[PDB]
Design a protein around this motif. Structure first.
Motif, PDB file in Angstrom:
ATOM      1  N   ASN A   1     166.227  16.391  36.242  1.00  0.00           N
ATOM      2  CA  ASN A   1     165.813  15.148  35.586  1.00  0.00           C
ATOM      3  C   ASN A   1     164.372  15.401  35.143  1.00  0.00           C
ATOM      4  OD1 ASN A   1     165.376  12.608  34.586  1.00  0.00           O
ATOM      5  ND2 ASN A   1     165.354  11.591  36.589  1.00  0.00           N
TER       6      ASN A   1
ATOM      7  N   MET B   1     170.955  14.610  35.731  1.00  0.00           N
ATOM      8  CA  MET B   1     170.972  13.183  36.026  1.00  0.00           C
ATOM      9  C   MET B   1     169.775  12.533  35.347  1.00  0.00           C
ATOM     10  SD  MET B   1     169.641  13.156  39.984  1.00  0.00           S
ATOM     11  CE  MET B   1     167.915  13.520  40.308  1.00  0.00           C
ATOM     12  N   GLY B   2     170.010  11.408  34.677  1.00  0.00           N
ATOM     13  CA  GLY B   2     168.958  10.750  33.925  1.00  0.00           C
ATOM     14  C   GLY B   2     168.787  11.364  32.550  1.00  0.00           C
ATOM     15  N   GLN B   3     167.979  12.420  32.469  1.00  0.00           N
ATOM     16  CA  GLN B   3     167.793  13.155  31.226  1.00  0.00           C
ATOM     17  C   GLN B   3     167.405  14.587  31.562  1.00  0.00           C
ATOM     18  OE1 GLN B   3     164.519  11.880  28.691  1.00  0.00           O
ATOM     19  NE2 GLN B   3     163.049  12.021  30.383  1.00  0.00           N
TER      20      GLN B   3
ATOM     21  N   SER C   1     174.011  10.680  31.380  1.00  0.00           N
ATOM     22  CA  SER C   1     172.853  11.550  31.238  1.00  0.00           C
ATOM     23  C   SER C   1     172.581  11.818  29.760  1.00  0.00           C
ATOM     24  CB  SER C   1     173.068  12.865  31.987  1.00  0.00           C
ATOM     25  OG  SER C   1     174.209  13.548  31.504  1.00  0.00           O
ATOM     26  N   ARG C   2     171.319  12.086  29.447  1.00  0.00           N
ATOM     27  CA  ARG C   2     170.891  12.385  28.091  1.00  0.00           C
ATOM     28  C   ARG C   2     170.318  13.794  28.040  1.00  0.00           C
ATOM     29  NH1 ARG C   2     166.685   8.283  25.616  1.00  0.00           N
ATOM     30  NH2 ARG C   2     165.191   9.609  26.735  1.00  0.00           N
TER      31      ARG C   2
END
Ligand SMILES: *C(=O)N1CC=C1/C=C/C(=O)NC(=O)/C=C/C(C)=C/C=C/[C@@H](O)CC
Lengths: 179, 181, 178, 182, 181, 181, 181, 177, 182, 179, 180
Positions: free
Chosen positions: H48, H76-78, H101-102
């Protein structure tokens, strides 16, 4: 300041005032003084107010508005570059039929901004006032543009850009200057 | 600072027009006093014209203007453009009776005095007493110029209270509204 | 910290009041007094005081704790005990308040300040005078001086040497040597 | 900006009017002395008018004006507008007896001298000893111009004390109140 | 700081929690954690909450209030030094019959404070919310003190100081702790 | 300072995690670590996530959201004090039927915030992504609350406040925790 | 500190020479507009000469000059000395057909508009759509004055590109190069 | 022990925040530690991160490839710039994204002040880094070098499902077991 | 403090004397360009005299002067007093052939361009390529006015190079040294 | 700046004031005043009052080269103090027309400098400041009559000279006490 | 920070030292302490120094150099990420045959940097000193790499970057680590 008595003074002798940059009490009072001066020299000849501003204080802008309406001479407004928030308001407050945009000018309209700190009672007093102002401004804009109050309300909830030709159709200005 | 053929604020001073602009303080107010004293000497008979666009300022500075307005022979007509808050509203109402004006979309806010002090408790009592006396004298003068009762001015200045151009003629702060020439 | 050292002296029932008095350091002093009480509610507590002053409310939370807990709180002034530090010095258990030979004590009236509307200014100025009145009352209570004398002597800063503090009544005696 | 007519203050100077505004300090006070010396040279017998609206300032700077008012032949009439505190209140009462004025809503504040020093206990005693003498001369001169006793000036100046215009008349700082031009 | 281990930890074994300084999300979250922990150790024994605070955030303070009311054990509140804004709220939110002030405690009550910047539409949104909060806080004050809703409003419009005996007469606390036993 | 017994760790053995303050990559990564740890100790026992936050970064908050949904145990969400922006989102992402507000909790929802400087080409790229993000957030909100996507869009264009009872009737929360057992 | 004789720039204004120097912004541009309007009044038939040495600036301010050049009757000859980048390069090519010039070692730089905004996603979409309209209109006017296709203007301005004086001729930015008088 | 450490005994490493020399060395040290404890069991790297320095990130990349154990990457998250680089460098078939996720990718950034000669030296190096960086991306994703070149000239966001199609990741984790 | 006569720089401008002082930048350079165009208008035959005392500045700003020097009809004589570094040293050598001068204890310093940029690698290549083109044209122009070879100017500007007044006449930057007048 | 200006009114008398630290801009005006006075009358002496604590070397040398180049003799008067470059220009006055006031102070020292960069660049700039040091000592020895080896030993560290000490050392010709 | 106990210390029990970040007196002294400690525990087993540094002070870096050469154990150097200025110097100062680069490591070399303010006399003193340093650093670089003193001079006058494979041919490193 191309000295000679700068250049802005030369063009004041031709009844041309320039409204540039953020509008605030001091630059606005300076515009009022010029309009009152030109009236004294000749209350029948029109005054020409060029507007290139990104906005400013409401109180300061309304001191110009009331002066434009008070003096006998008609105040023609010309938008060059951009006229946002109060600059757009004063642009539309010009004498009917003599409000102009240049071909690649730009206009932005939105609702008033504000803020306050203090006790909840004071917050209510100041919150109810800025809304009173919002109503006062939408009413006046509806009057000068020919739109309905409800239309002004919906289009000012968020920033709205209008091109020079879009500014004529919506009613803020009368025509586009050419040649 | 545009100029004619010699500054603009000076040219309008020959037509007996004074501008009260911005925050009120000892120096800008002393400059207003000087212009009033000057115009009186050249012609005591003719009226003086004081435009007011101010968000407030110091009491002491404002009272130097108020006492000068009442002391000089010529009547001082007050014109509110934009806004006249705190002391700006007070000096607006101190104009000659029948010659106090608001522009159609002017605004006038009124409230009680503000202040503050740090120091010994004994010193705090001294300054707390004085600021309350100031509050008393201002409400008295406010009631005198508006025609309101002292008790009403007390009620309405405890908290900020905005007023429109027509509301200011009703309450008594101004005599009429300037609408077109 | 030589370590812990303030704790090793806490088992001997020694609390140190040092520096400016404020809510957080005072709360720590209150916590130690409550702790020592729990360990032994009968035995004396020993409060060393070296402070140039501080907040009244924070200091009064210490004062109220000393009077509330069962054990007597003996006060010892080392270095100096000014404004609120001097108040807590004299609030010690009668007969167990002490100054060291070259200690210094300063007394004065409360300080304060406020910004706002005149109505609000009036409320807070009337409160600080109520506070000024109460401390002078408590000062007169612990020293034995009259309320009129405390008023006269606290209007402006007054310094007292260690022996001057025993005559004035702030403290009972001087610790010289064991 | 200052409007033209030359300056605005320059024509009222031709009318024998000087303005004391803001904090008093060596430079603005020296300018007041310069104007007073100029008016005396133009005509020593005609009065000078000194408007006072000040919250206080440096004592040394204020005394350069006081000694100039006392030194020149022309009487210096003093007018208090707005407020006249600390050094401003002193110069107000130092005006020519009979020619000191307050406006109806003026406010006057008096208090003892203030100061401060950092350094040697030896140096501290020197500077603490000088400021007490200044306090002594200041109280004496105040007692002289007001008619109050030295014992009274001392008590009323120990702490800040505000006086209204009529109160300033009764205490002796000022002679009368100007309300409407005759 | 004094690692006996840690004094505040040893006093927690005795069910004593300290609410000190400005109340805010983090210091308040610790108080909630202590209350939930003490409840698990014994849901029947009371919890003792010392209060010395000059005020703080309402939302942070309300996380403590709702935890005090939710857990089984009664939470006795003791005011030492002073208890202003949220400190006075949590003080009076203690168990009915178990709220205390020290002899020289000081309590201050006042209405909520706030502020916002943005569009007039957004201002109306947030200005209406703070007024809702003011309504609920005054309602909760009337509930815990026994005062009428109309009375809490009239006394909280501006800062109001209460002495320890004054806080008992008003209903903020129940009694004053003077000398144990 | 943290009262030891650590206190948040002693509550971590009771499967209680606290989400406090502004959500950001580092505090959120710690929340994921506690959830993964508790899952390893017992994938069948429920997890208890207290939420008191005024908002924070989206990506950081979504790292928590995806972790809540991925692990086997149900994550019950409890709002104490307030739950604004992303904090309110994670509140509604709790396990079906196990989302709670305290009696005086406050929930705030609004649309995403952002900003960018650079060339017009780059401006379009980031302006398009936040619009995708905005679209996905409204979809997930509609899924967990039961409201329509049209309704969520109306209610998030500008700040909207919901009380604890308003949050149950809207679908943000299942019930209100008032007293215990 | 301009050298006096009038001043140097004024003595050069009596020859219909205007100087655009430094970053373009509302105020420096407004003076240029005033000078152009003044010269038109002195003689609507004689050409005006605009020297350009600028690294760029605000678009709106620059377009107030562009619209003024097109509005006044006299032809506006543009001379680039030193450099003419972003809006300075736009005004350079907006000069009268046949009368746009570079000095032998002048330099021209073109690139797409830059900008930025912070706020709600809805507001972001509004401002991103506007800067793209501006980018479109600026590209259109550039294609017009250079004779290049719109696609070419778009493809060469996506990133910073530098043109020497001779390169500016074969691109259409300028008509010829001034070497010796 | 600690929560990040308690999960280290289960071979889980967290790459969080900006990538820089010091946080990256902690990632390198944990991988070497884990390797020593068991060079066969897989290692788990959660990502992340919004990006960071290339050299610091490349110290992680070369260590992941050097150590015997497979390094599984989970976003996870980005996972942007170098965080996206390390996500894709995970062992083939064991790279994962979470449902929301990005991922953001772009070309290298840099800057230098000095003489023109020195400017040429550093501008030539960053173009060499950009080349090697794009080459590694093409190898792990399966894309052509030309495609990576087109897609990294400017910032480009990929959703979790877009990341499996583009080749950055192998599959999407939704629920455990 | 700007001595008056009228102003002093304005009195020497009437004598066709321009001063290039301090750091070179768009505005001070634009002012120099205006003076040169003005003097040309007064008399396109008489020469113009440009004193140079500068530690360097922006190239574009300096090139606006250079192109003006070569474009106008009158010869631009350059006089170096004190120092003439980077852009000052080029303008010095760009003066009219035979009328470039150093004072006996003047100093000339030359080096290659400085610059910098932050951004994406693609943008870096654009600006890195451009500054190398500028460096090329600068060496080209430097070689032309001095009589040196392009390769020599390159080898001498890679790193800072100081030249004395006599060293500058041999290298070709200036024509002679003014020691005493006439 | 009383009165038209006072420094301008004394310029008609051929009096120039060098005050404060010397730098490119203040030095340019002294050069301008010297060039102007030369044009007005190349035969009357120029009077340069010096009260300066030092300054930039290059800026000071633009004055030195101007003093020596113009025809008229430049008389120097030191009032207050003349340190670093201020002392150099004092001694650069026309022989027999350099003066000190009775309690003026002159201080001399060697050049100061500094640089950051690569070692190769460090060698270039250290090499250059030593060339500057070499010239400055040569010129001081030339104008004072002292030996070069003596100027070096005496400028290695700060050296103060009284007005009478300055006449023996050769910086100045005589002392103006009264008249 | 991950209390295994501690992670960097757990690997110090495998004779692994990490040189990370700027080189300066204090971080270098910590590296010296670890080398002296490892020597005491076992003077025969090799020591492993991972290097990821953008440069730093010369004197501080040379305190590491002299310690690596003084202690009996050979110091094998591992370049991960980058090894610039003093980081590159210490990388190549490792025991010959035990210097390594990772596949995408980056080595940068240049001449010394410096600066001083003061009197001209003092300027010459410090200038002569940095040149004596410059000449001495180039000498050792030539010794450890096998390049000539003239080549080291030419190549350090300006920033020069070397890739992992370029570093083996120049002599900075012995081989490239790729798998295990
Ligand atoms: C030559 O100067 N040019 C060709 C490429 C360049 C770059 C020049 C540059 O960056 N110039 C500056 O900004 C120089 C500034 C300096 C040295 C200022 C000195 C000011 C004095 O106050 C120092 C005593």
């Amino acid at each position: 300041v191309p000295m000679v008595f700068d250049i802005y003074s030369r063009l004041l002798k031709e009844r041309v005032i320039f409204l540039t940059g953020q509008v605030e009490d001091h630059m606005a009072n300076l515009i009022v003084a010029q309009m009152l001066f030109l009236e004294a020299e000749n209350p029948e000849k029109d005054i020409y107010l060029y507007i290139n501003s990104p906005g400013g204080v409401i109180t300061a802008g309304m001191s110009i508005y009331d002066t434009m309406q008070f003096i006998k001479p008609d105040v023609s407004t010309i938008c060059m570059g951009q006229a946002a928030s109060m600059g757009a308001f004063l642009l539309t407050a010009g004498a009917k039929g003599k409000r102009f945009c240049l071909p690649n000018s730009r206009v932005m309209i939105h609702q008033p901004l504000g803020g306050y700190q203090g006790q909840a009672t004071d917050i209510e007093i100041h919150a109810r006032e800025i809304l009173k102002v919002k109503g006062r401004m939408n009413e006046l804009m509806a009057l000068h543009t020919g739109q309905s109050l409800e239309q002004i309300e919906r289009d000012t909830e968020r920033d709205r850009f209008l091109s020079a030709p879009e500014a004529v159709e919506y009613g803020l200005v009368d025509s586009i200057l050419t040649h």
